[PDB]
Amino acid sequence: VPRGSEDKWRNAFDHMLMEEFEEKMDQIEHGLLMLSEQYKELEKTKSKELKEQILRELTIAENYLRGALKFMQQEAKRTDLNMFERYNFETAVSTIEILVKDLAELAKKVKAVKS
Amino acid sequence: GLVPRGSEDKWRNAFDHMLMEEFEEKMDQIEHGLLMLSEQYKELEKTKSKELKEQILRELTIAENYLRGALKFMQQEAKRTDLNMFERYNFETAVSTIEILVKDLAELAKKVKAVK
């Protein structure tokens, strides 16, 4: 890929990694949606085990997302990015930030269940 | 909430399971990419193309950054206080696998930089 293109991934690892990130992102979103459903069950049952297990899964997703965030922020700062690339890294950052926010919202709710 | 906290033979957490499968796939991909870059290093040896050299370095640098991140992450998971045997085995193996890949990357980088 010429260094001069502005409309594509110029590096093969960049493309491969975005692609790994996006799949991971949709999976996490889906897991969060499943945990929301489980929070609704928790609301009714008050099961200490469900509560604990939801908290554990939220903590692992959070850790992973904090890791991806750090990685993507750094990539966004690169000095050699074309517009396409910088856009993509910046959008990944925002997407992670929203997911982290949603996790933390759900965590608050779960902790608040009186089991 | 399903898997009992006393299982020793399986992932007890859904996100652990999900991310680890996703990690193994990625490792194989990175391995294949390193293999492709080695091939390209051989071409570089003959042609001495500055652009090929620069591009291989760039890709190596991106793969290294990603692998050092994954290494930090996996080391940390391996230090969890609540792991069963199956989980610890998996995290610890992931850590070793990442280390080997990082070493291979760095070896390839040395060779590339040495192309005049």
Numbering used by the authors:
A (entry chain A): 3 to 117
B (entry chain B): 1 to 116
Lines quoted from the article behind this entry:
Among these, group 21 allergens including Blo t 217, Der p 218 and Der f 219 identified in B. tropicalis, D. pteronyssinus and D. farinae, respectively, are known as mid-tier allergens in the allergic response.
Furthermore, knowing that only PEG 400 but not PEG 2K MME can fit within the cavity, we further deduce that a molecule of a size similar to PEG400 may exist as a physiologically active molecule for Der f 21.
